Design a protein around this nucleic acid. Structure first.
Ligand SMILES: [K+]
Ligand SMILES: [K+]
Ligand SMILES: [K+]
Ligand SMILES: [K+]
Ligand SMILES: [K+]
Ligand SMILES: [K+]
Ligand SMILES: [K+]
Ligand SMILES: [Mg+2]
Ligand SMILES: [Mg+2]
Ligand SMILES: [Mg+2]
Ligand SMILES: [Mg+2]
Ligand SMILES: [Mg+2]
Ligand SMILES: [Mg+2]
Ligand SMILES: [Mg+2]
Ligand SMILES: [Mg+2]
Ligand SMILES: [Mg+2]
Ligand SMILES: [Mg+2]
Ligand SMILES: [Mg+2]
Ligand SMILES: [Mg+2]
Ligand SMILES: [Mg+2]
Ligand SMILES: [Mg+2]
Ligand SMILES: [Mg+2]
Ligand SMILES: [Mg+2]
Ligand SMILES: [Mg+2]
Ligand SMILES: [Mg+2]
Ligand SMILES: [Mg+2]
Ligand SMILES: [Mg+2]
Ligand SMILES: [Mg+2]
Ligand SMILES: [Mg+2]
Ligand SMILES: [Mg+2]
Ligand SMILES: [Mg+2]
Ligand SMILES: [Mg+2]
Ligand SMILES: [Mg+2]
Ligand SMILES: [Mg+2]
Ligand SMILES: [Mg+2]
Ligand SMILES: [Mg+2]
Ligand SMILES: [Mg+2]
Ligand SMILES: [Mg+2]
Ligand SMILES: [Mg+2]
Ligand SMILES: [Mg+2]
Ligand SMILES: [Mg+2]
Ligand SMILES: [Mg+2]
Ligand SMILES: [Mg+2]
Ligand SMILES: [Mg+2]
Ligand SMILES: [Mg+2]
Ligand SMILES: [Zn+2]
Lengths: 118, 150, 43, 305, 99, 110, 154
RNA sequence: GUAAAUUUAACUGUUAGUCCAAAGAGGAACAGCUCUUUGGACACUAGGAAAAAACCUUGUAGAGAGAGUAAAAAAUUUAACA
RNA sequence: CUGAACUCCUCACACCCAAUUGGACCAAUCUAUCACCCUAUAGAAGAACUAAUGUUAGUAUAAGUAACAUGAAAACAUUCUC
RNA sequence: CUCUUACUUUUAACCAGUGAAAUUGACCUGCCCGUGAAGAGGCGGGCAUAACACAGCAAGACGAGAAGACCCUAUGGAGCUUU
RNA sequence: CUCGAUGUUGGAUCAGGACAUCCCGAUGGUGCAGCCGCUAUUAAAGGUUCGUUUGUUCAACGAUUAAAGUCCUACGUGAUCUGAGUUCAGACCGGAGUAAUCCAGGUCGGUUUCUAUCUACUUUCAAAUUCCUCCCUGUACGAAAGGACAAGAGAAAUAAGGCCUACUUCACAAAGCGCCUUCCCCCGUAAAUGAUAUCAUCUCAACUUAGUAUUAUACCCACACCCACCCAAGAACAGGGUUUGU
């Protein structure tokens, strides 16, 4: 599920990935959104490739990295799994995901007027 | 260098010192000259020091060959078969008395770089670490997102 | 982009240096010592 | 450990026999595919918007003038279809692409000069080897059974096509003929500098940009000319009269297919789909198929009245 | 010259290696390197990086005992920070004095 | 333009000993069925072609002793005869070249 | 770019090329066999073939006599063309010459070739011979042929 | 509180100075500019400021698969109005 | 918490500045007297070379590169082309 | 020249034979930005990257060649002129 | 920094890049009726003429153009060129000087070497830009004079990539003066609904629309018969054909 990553702030619009084809006028600059729609695994792949040591071993470590946009995984790679690492970020709950217990547990703070149209 | 030289791991000869200590120095061969200023310090070592040195080390066979020579040498042979040749050219008795004793204390193993300052044949007692050492087991040994009884 | 004219840390137009948080604490730690030195040099 | 050819150990009596033997087999193999609608053809779907059918592989004969009914003169290129068949078919899934591929070959060649792996592919297909094999991207509703023959009536007059071929090889050439550089003047002091590129880059970068125009080998690459219409179709010899010139030399194999230009989009509604089958045609076609604005040679002289 | 200056790098790179191996063995037990080293010193346990990293490889059951001790002394420090001195010190927070 | 630096023997061995520089083995060699010497499949046998030239030269030396000068070629055909042969039925009215030698076995009379 | 060029560039120019080919053809008509570089013979072989065609036209045709007079530097060979060579190939319509490759010469290791007029009075060259019909492979094919012929008659 | 100093005897080399802070002159309250003064560093080692002669930390020399430290990381997000 | 050649720890200690200056050792050679598989004490001196577009010699790089050469056939007699 | 083109010859390239010269601290001799004796293949942060010949090109190696002839200095020279 | 050498004017050749936009595109304001203009926002894909005098860069002038942009790149580029100028040795004029000789001076003349070792590069494969004409139309606008935009159609130029039927240079072929083909967009703003602020309000409020392409698709895709020969393939190598290996 590398297609459902979430950026903080306005990084989808502000963040830019720049490359060069080597030819005159071959300098390209796209935003994270443009790259994500074109390659749903490039953002996560480029962040990891920049965190690995700047040496010859890095391209060998990236062959041992397997990215999939959706939750589908091949059988072979799915038969040799061992452990699932916990998500670092805790996904907050939408207001439609709270049960009627927590909603009534949280107290009301103010008393709206009865003559208000709202 | 280290890269320009060989190396070895710290070791002993026949697990020496484990059950008993056996002196590895096995033979000493001196070559002094009756005449010659180079051998003056070696001649005085043979008059008062060598006899008292043999009393303390009865397992070492000492040979004193007095012959014409310009450079006196002492050859030390060890149980393991190693042979170290050294020169006592123009050395005082005090310098030759500490040298011969150094040879008796050594084991014969090549005097080269030693990789580790320690050696143990049984490094672990609770189990050498492996990836699954500190991992918990799951019910029915299932894998991440594996459908059971399908 | 981002050239500092001439040599970085000399001249008219220098590369700006900013005070970190530990640099402040390091200076405050020194001050607390010398402030206590004034007390023992007073009797 | 010495290589051999097909007639190295044969005698004077077996060389003529072997030649005629394999020649008669090719005749029988080619004359056994003329009835594709009776030999368990695949389903024949109709034409739907957004459908892409196969193309052909023709041979460039030459060039011929052509006049219209307005008096204007047009030059056309003669593309002859000879021994064109469908070799294999790959589905969208197995294609690893949006479309599905259909393989087509042309111009039967000798079996004595081909690779073993290639010979066995044709052995089970029931066809002689082909010189050129090109891949066409089609839709699921245009798949044709392998071994099916293909003819020039697969196209119609008034239809635009895209012809692809290798360009004439001119070898290593300088910048004046390869890139159109002006060069240097002939006189006024010029010293051994008349057809040189001059400066190749600036001094600051200290290098030469990739893609810099330099001397090198020109031609002998694949090029495509889009927007060529079919003026005339001969059915007796399977010849296609295409407008204008096409890349490549005479007697060269070219790839032909419907044009991708948006202006000619969805114009195959009145065309054969998937392809033209003469075996099952309810009525044979005329000798030649002309366009409305073409004046045939037998027609009377033009008169602006 | 390189071999003579390399004797300072060897000592530095060793301690860098030990710390990297201790950091890894502490995360297996939900600890960070500063919380292990700092709280083992608070228990008067003077074990260096070299030994600790050796214990993490060849004596894993003893290294978890050291991590559990550090986590215990770390939790006692928080408990004492919540009180105003009235509550007595923890069992593992006591310090042996040497005269 | 002059070399900026000296090229090393390591660099030069890779250029000199590149397979393209090396000589390529030939597989078109075979034995001549007549003499048993070696030959190429597309080239004539050097040994058998040489014995034709030795005899052909002797025949051309005899032709000169008959012409006895330049610009004296005949307007008829020519025939070569050896010790133990006479003009054939078809070899009538021709220029016979007598050879004081036994007819080569490979030389077949036509 | 040389597409379609059939003639080679030898000698010192177009005229010198014709003069080199003429000296080889003249020696080929006198001796009926010569050895020369492979390229120079392959280029002259065409002229030796068309020279016989002019000799079959007869010595009474002025055009044919103007070709031989030009292409034959030695004038005693002109009657030999019309009276000896052309009659020999009267029945044949082509293939008057055979060209064969020989070992490269020692001086410059140049590719060589021998060319002669068929029907000459010189010791036969060691021509290449095809494998005998009595070989294993040809006997397996001879048997295959018989059946294919026997089945056809049936 | 410290251990240097002066004199006597006998000599060589240095006498083409760089940045930083401070007080000033000239210039344009320009210069990696020029000219004096006070002090520091460099022209010797190491660590840090990204790379770094001149900024900060730090000096007296060896080995060690021990330890405690020093200097040492950049922060900020904006305009309603009766 | 990390972090030096700062400091502590085990052991050792003359063993990190240009010019200049002071001092302790020493290779080889000759001589005196010893020595006698190569040394000793002294006395002497053409007494020590990673560098002077250094001198001589050898061999590399450039480089198997630039450049150099023989008119044709044939019987080697001769003829032919220019 | 607009605006070049075609052919011949020499050169060329391949085979064979013969076989120089300036040059060269060592080299396992990439690109971008920045840094810096102030213009980096060699330093810092990044990107790129199996090995190898042949033929071309002349942007860079502050490319080779000649201890700059311009300018200044030397109590360094010389030629010419002169009250 | 470089004088045990960093070759310096302009031009030719090839151009890389910036936007502070000369033309083409999209917008707001106007003392914008319209046709022409002024001004600002956005946009660097594409393009930006031929000549007379001058060594010239500039400048003036003539004829054009949709426009004939400003700058950097060692005042880009001389191991690619050019040498008119500047900048040695000759000489003349005027002036200075007793003379030798000299001048911001003017004038005529005057040798531009290098066989590429390394780095880099040597097919960024394929979506194209603009003018004019007809028409709309003598329509909107406007007192008059005057005179549009959009839609549509046609015909050219340049550029890129190809070809030889004819013409032309030529003649088993190579060429242009000849012929054929050429397909997407870019964001400045203008508008609705509606809170903070119960009106209103295009919203760095949630939101809606003009308004957006995974730039589309196209091209390429088999492999020891391969000694030899041939070729529209080619420096060599490689490649294609030989069912035409006397
Ligand atoms: K500065
Ligand atoms: K560069
Ligand atoms: K031409
Ligand atoms: K260059
Ligand atoms: K130079
Ligand atoms: K200079
Ligand atoms: K508002
Ligand atoms: Mg700088
Ligand atoms: Mg070609
Ligand atoms: Mg020209
Ligand atoms: Mg010249
Ligand atoms: Mg010229
Ligand atoms: Mg002074
Ligand atoms: Mg002075
Ligand atoms: Mg200064
Ligand atoms: Mg430390
Ligand atoms: Mg210290
Ligand atoms: Mg010390
Ligand atoms: Mg000695
Ligand atoms: Mg000396
Ligand atoms: Mg030496
Ligand atoms: Mg020297
Ligand atoms: Mg070379
Ligand atoms: Mg040459
Ligand atoms: Mg050669
Ligand atoms: Mg040099
Ligand atoms: Mg730089
Ligand atoms: Mg090269
Ligand atoms: Mg260098
Ligand atoms: Mg000088
Ligand atoms: Mg003098
Ligand atoms: Mg130099
Ligand atoms: Mg702008
Ligand atoms: Mg532009
Ligand atoms: Mg310039
Ligand atoms: Mg030049
Ligand atoms: Mg240059
Ligand atoms: Mg001049
Ligand atoms: Mg005068
Ligand atoms: Mg002049
Ligand atoms: Mg003149
Ligand atoms: Mg060159
Ligand atoms: Mg209009
Ligand atoms: Mg509203
Ligand atoms: Mg409202
Ligand atoms: Zn033979």
């Amino acid at each position: 599920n590398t297609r459902h990553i979430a950026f903080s702030g306005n990084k989808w619009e502000q963040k830019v990935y720049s490359s060069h084809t080597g030819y005159p006028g071959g300098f390209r600059q796209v935003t994270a959104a443009q790259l994500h729609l074109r390659d749903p695994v490039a953002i996560v792949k480029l962040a990891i490739y920049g965190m690995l040591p700047k040496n010859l071993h890095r391209r060998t470590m990236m062959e041992r990295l397997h990215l999939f946009p959706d939750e589908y995984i091949p059988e072979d790679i799915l038969k040799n799994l061992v452990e699932e690492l916990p998500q670092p970020r805790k996904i907050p709950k939408r207001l439609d995901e709270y049960t009627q217990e927590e909603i009534d547990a949280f107290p009301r703070l103010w008393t709206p007027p009865e003559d208000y149209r709202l | 260098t280290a890269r320009g030289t060989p190396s070895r791991f710290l070791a002993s000869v026949l697990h020496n010192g484990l059950g008993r200590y056996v002196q590895q120095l096995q033979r000493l061969s001196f070559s002094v000259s009756r005449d010659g200023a180079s051998s003056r310090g070696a001649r005085e070592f043979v008059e008062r020091e060598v006899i008292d040195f043999a009393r303390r080390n009865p397992g070492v066979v000492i040979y004193v060959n007095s012959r014409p020579c310009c450079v006196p040498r002492v050859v030390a042979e060890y149980l393991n078969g190693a042979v170290r040749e050294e020169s006592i050219h123009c050395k005082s008795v005090e310098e030759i008395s500490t040298l011969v004793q150094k040879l008796a204390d050594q084991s014969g193993l090549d005097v080269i770089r030693i990789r580790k300052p320690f050696h143990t044949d049984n490094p672990s007692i609770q189990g050498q670490w492996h990836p699954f050492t500190n991992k918990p087991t799951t019910f029915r040994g299932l894998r991440p997102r594996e459908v059971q009884d399908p | 982009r981002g050239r500092i004219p001439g040599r970085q840390w000399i001249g008219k137009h220098r590369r700006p240096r900013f005070v970190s948080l530990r640099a402040k604490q390091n200076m405050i730690r020194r001050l607390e010592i010398e402030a206590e030195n004034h007390y023992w040099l007073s009797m | 450990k010495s290589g051999t050819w097909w007639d190295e150990h044969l005698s004077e009596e077996n060389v003529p026999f072997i030649k005629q033997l394999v020649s008669d087999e090719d005749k029988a193999q080619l004359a056994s595919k003329l009835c594709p609608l009776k030999d368990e053809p695949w389903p024949i779907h109709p034409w739907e918007p957004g459908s892409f059918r196969v193309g052909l592989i023709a041979l460039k004969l030459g060039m011929m003038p052509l006049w219209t009914k307005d008096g204007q003169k047009h030059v056309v290129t003669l593309l002859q279809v000879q021994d064109c068949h469908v070799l294999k078919y790959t589905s969208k899934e197995n294609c690893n692409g949006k479309m599905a591929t259909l393989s087509v070959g042309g111009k039967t060649v000798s079996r004595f000069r081909k690779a073993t792996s290639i010979l066995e592919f044709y052995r089970e297909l029931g066809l002689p080897p082909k010189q050129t094999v090109k891949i066409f991207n089609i839709t699921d509703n245009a798949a044709i059974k392998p071994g099916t023959p293909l003819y020039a009536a697969h196209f119609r007059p008034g239809q635009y096509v895209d012809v692809t071929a290798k360009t004439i090889g001119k070898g290593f050439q300088g910048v004046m003929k390869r890139w159109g550089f002006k060069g240097q003047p002939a006189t006024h002091g010029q010293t051994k500098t008349h057809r040189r590129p001059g400066a190749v880059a600036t001094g600051d970068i200290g290098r030469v940009w990739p893609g810099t125009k330099m001397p090198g080998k020109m031609g002998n690459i694949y090029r495509t000319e889009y927007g060529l219409k079919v003026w005339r179709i001969n059915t007796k010899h399977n010849i296609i009269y295409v407008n204008g010139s096409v890349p490549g030399h005479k007697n060269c194999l070219v790839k032909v297919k419907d044009s991708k230009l948006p202006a000619y989009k969805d114009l195959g509604k009145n065309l054969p789909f998937p392809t033209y089958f003469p075996d099952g045609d309810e009525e044979e076609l005329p000798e030649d198929l002309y366009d409305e604005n073409v004046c045939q040679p037998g027609a009377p002289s033009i008169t602006f009245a | 010259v390189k071999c003579t200056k390399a004797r300072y790098l060897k000592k530095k790179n060793m301690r860098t290696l030990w710390i990297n191996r201790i950091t890894a063995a502490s995360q297996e037990h939900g600890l960070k390197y500063p919380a292990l080293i700092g709280n083992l010193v608070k228990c008067q346990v003077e074990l260096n990086r070299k030994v600790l990293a050796d214990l993490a490889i060849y004596e894993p059951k003893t290294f978890k005992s050291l991590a559990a001790l550090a986590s215990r002394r770390r939790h006692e420090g928080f408990a004492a920070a919540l009180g105003d001195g009235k509550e007595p010190e923890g069992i593992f927070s006591r310090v042996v004095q040497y005269h | 333009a002059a070399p900026k630096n000296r090229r090393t023997i390591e660099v030069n061995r890779c250029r000199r000993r590149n397979p393209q520089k090396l000589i390529k083995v030939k597989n078109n060699i075979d034995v001549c069925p007549e003499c048993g010497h070696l030959k190429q499949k597309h080239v004539l046998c050097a040994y058998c072609y040489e014995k034709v030239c030795k005899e052909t030269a002797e025949i051309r030396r005899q032709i000169g002793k008959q012409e006895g000068g330049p610009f004296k070629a005949p307007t008829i055909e020519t025939v070569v005869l050896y010790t133990g042969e006479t003009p054939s039925e078809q070899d009538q009215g021709k220029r016979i070249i007598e050879r004081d030698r036994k007819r080569p076995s490979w030389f077949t009379q036509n | 770019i040389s597409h379609g060029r059939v003639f080679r560039r030898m000698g010192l120019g177009p005229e010198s090329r014709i003069h080199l080919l003429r000296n080889l053809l003249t020696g080929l008509v006198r001796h009926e066999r010569i050895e020369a570089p492979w390229a120079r013979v392959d280029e002259m072989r065409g002229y030796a073939e068309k020279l016989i065609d002019y000799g079959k036209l007869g010595d009474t045709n002025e055009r044919a006599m103007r070709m031989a007079d030009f292409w034959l530097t030695e004038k005693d060979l002109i009657p030999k063309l019309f009276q000896v060579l052309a009659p020999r190939y009267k029945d044949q319509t082509g293939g008057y010459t055979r060209m064969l490759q020989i070992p490269n010469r020692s001086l410059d290791r140049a590719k060589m070739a021998v060319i002669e007029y068929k029907g000459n009075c010189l010791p036969p060259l060691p021509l290449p011979r095809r494998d005998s019909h009595l070989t294993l492979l040809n006997q397996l094919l001879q048997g295959l042929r018989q059946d294919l012929r026997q089945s056809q008659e049936a």
